[PDB]
Design a protein around this ligand. Sequence first.
Ligand SMILES: O=C1c2ccccc2C(=O)N1CCOC(=S)Nc1ccc(I)cc1
Lengths: 544, 395
Amino acid sequence: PISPIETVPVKLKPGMDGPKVKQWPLTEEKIKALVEICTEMEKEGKISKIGPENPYNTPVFAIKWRKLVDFRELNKRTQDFWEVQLGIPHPAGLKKKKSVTVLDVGDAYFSVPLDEDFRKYTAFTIPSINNETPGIRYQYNVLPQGWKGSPAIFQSSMTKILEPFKKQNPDIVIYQYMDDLYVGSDLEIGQHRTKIEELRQHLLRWGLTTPDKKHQKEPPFLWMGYELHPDKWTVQPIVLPEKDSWTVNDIQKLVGKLNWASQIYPGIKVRQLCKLLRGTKALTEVIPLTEEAELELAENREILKEPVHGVYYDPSKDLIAEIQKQGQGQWTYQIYQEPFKNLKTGKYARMRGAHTNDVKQLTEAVQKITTESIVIWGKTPKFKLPIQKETWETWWTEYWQATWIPEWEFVNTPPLVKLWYQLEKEPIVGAETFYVDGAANRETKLGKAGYVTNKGRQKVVPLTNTTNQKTELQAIYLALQDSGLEVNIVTDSQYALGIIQAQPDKSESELVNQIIEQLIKKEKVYLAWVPAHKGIGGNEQVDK
Amino acid sequence: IETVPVKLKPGMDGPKVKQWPLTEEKIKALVEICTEMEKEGKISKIGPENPYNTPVFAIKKKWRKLVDFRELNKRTQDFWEVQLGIPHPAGLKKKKSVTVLDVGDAYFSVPLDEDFRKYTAFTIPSINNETPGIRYQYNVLPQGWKGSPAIFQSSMTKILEPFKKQNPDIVIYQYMDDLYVGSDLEIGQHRTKIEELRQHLLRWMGYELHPDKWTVQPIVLPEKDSWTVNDIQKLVGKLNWASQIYPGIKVRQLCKLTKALTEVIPLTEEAELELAENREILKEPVHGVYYDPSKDLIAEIQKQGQGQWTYQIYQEPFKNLKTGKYAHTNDVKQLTEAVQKITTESIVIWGKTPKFKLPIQKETWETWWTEYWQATWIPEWEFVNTPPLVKLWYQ
Ligand SMILES: O=C1c2ccccc2C(=O)N1CCOC(=S)Nc1ccc(I)cc1
């Protein structure tokens, strides 16, 4: 049918006019297909024979028999609409329903009225057996298939018309996705089916027809890669058949499928499989599966052995989020309300920063979970972290950046997060003082990294092909080597001070990683800063 | 009735900013708000033919709707600033007492240029995107739009005309939604003039500010009385940085005083002559720094630990127009308050808000900033990696 819903005022962009592109004559048959089709549509009221001469026109053609109008031109000249793509519910955010049904709308776009003042713009011509006679002119009376306002105006229409029934049945839940309606409820089958015919009948009063008893309804639903039961949810079934050869293409898809599953499958690992992709990779090259990964694939297969489903959300219960340190850079977490009955699973493994330490990462994870929990449940979870509340406040307090975790509490699931060393806050007494510095020719791309002492010593390992910065972490490094378990170092490089002064415990820099391990063996280290080329006792001597 | 033609800067297009996810509790409070507002004709539902959006939040101060017109404002500046800009009196900052009155709730009288309403569109989201999301537009002067006071000046001036005349020594300044009214009257007297003013407003105390009593945050040097290499090293360290501000600082004599770090050493009689004068400077105002009304204001904040926070305001890196400090509290809660305080003072002083550089993670700030916010404006902000020594040189 055609809904009587009032239309949406459509307009062309600021100073642009209707489109006017000419028709690439078609073939005998395609012409015949177009005529049959239009005639029917024409009978349905979906279109109208346009008289005089609408100077406007958009190409039309047939594909095998169906008709496709080319709408680019009209599109580009058409206004912008409120985005229909803002987000899609996560299943773990859904409340539990007793009965679910899915009615699909037939001929949606075609069942919704286009704005009459705009109809004139959608004019097209079915050619004559070869550019001889004018041709049958047609404009649209309803949302055309390829048009840009159709998805928007439709979604707005379906809502306005769905509003009254919702209001007379607030206890009921209805979700619109494209050409479908998911209806859920806590009514018992018998009474639920009544409630649906009541909907279909309300929906027919508004021009929208639905499946009689064909209701695709009746769970295991497939929506956006999910499988949906009224009581539980899980990700769509995924297989990983045997293979002795893996192409970039293959392991691409595998990584993707793994990542998607890790949404409800606890302990999904893809770190080792991600490496194999490192480097400029042709999609068809076979990549030998390394050892660290060899096992990872089957241990993945293992946890995917028996299916797993997540539960739904109970608005009258706190959320519990707990996180697990898993390998280096990798983090994992679960979210539940009743111990170990998960709502959703997830992991976090990134960097974005050059230098970092577990305590920072843990906080980032909590942060990501915090905003994920907001968008989904509209409230914040209670945390359980593998960090002593003390070891958190220390860092919390001393650090120069602000932070604020929601309510949390300690949980002893090793490995535990901790600082791997603590720089002295005051100069060490009776321990070698090391005035260190670096240099480098910006042209020769080489430099000298050295140091001098309050005890006469002196060095200078020459370095080849290093920037002006390395020869500063190199120096500090050199000093942490020739010194005893207890020391204090003087730099003129704030670059190095900042790095080391934030208690890194891991970095994407082989030099920094060395300085790290070294810092962990000492029993006292003090790093002070003094201005460069300011001839300060000690620094100057090493500058020479 | 009579609408003031509002035109978006020639060329520029409406704002199209996405709505931030909100908590269930705030969402609920927004609908109840937005239900009353349309019931009394202040806002209207809109359709998909409107591709515009501005974010909304809920604050307490009893919930209150708060729209973030940061973007709309940046795209209409010509209107509110060079078209109908309000002049800022230098006297305000000099008065003993300044009271901040919330007068926003009066823009709802004047209607907005129909042709301009579609740019004021906002969205009330829904938990987990289970429902489309309720769309609105204003059909009257919105509270957070710099255009409102601009348009609302004729009414404002008429309202004040009498009060001013009877009180020609009272400075009244308007900046978005707020009136700043200061005087040199004694405590109680001032408060009586405010109440006597509130009544004028009616026919169409609260926030005690004391600007006149604001002074520089002097960079201080340790007093000590023994001094060590490390000590003197740090001592010159900040004296170096200070060199880049406060023309005259001389670290030469100090810097002329290999050697262990923990080795105590007695300064030179000539030494005191240095940090003495250097001390006399730093306490005195900077020489050569002037506010430039055409340049935007920057503000850096550093975390001093112990609920302490230092801050500087400048238009050019290192040349400071002003520096100061600020004392269930958390990092983000204290920082939010700091940002609010610094901004009030900026407005009182220059009639504009500074652009903030925040020592925090973008997501962390974005997640929580709303929780403790109370002002009805929102300054521009950026996120930075607090330089280790910069924090120390302002301790
Ligand atoms: O019915 C849906 C539905 C189906 C698929 C995807 C998203 C969706 C939705 O938001 N809604 C509305 C809310 O549904 C709620 S609260 N609970 C449900 C709905 C459907 C099912 I199967 C299980 C649980």
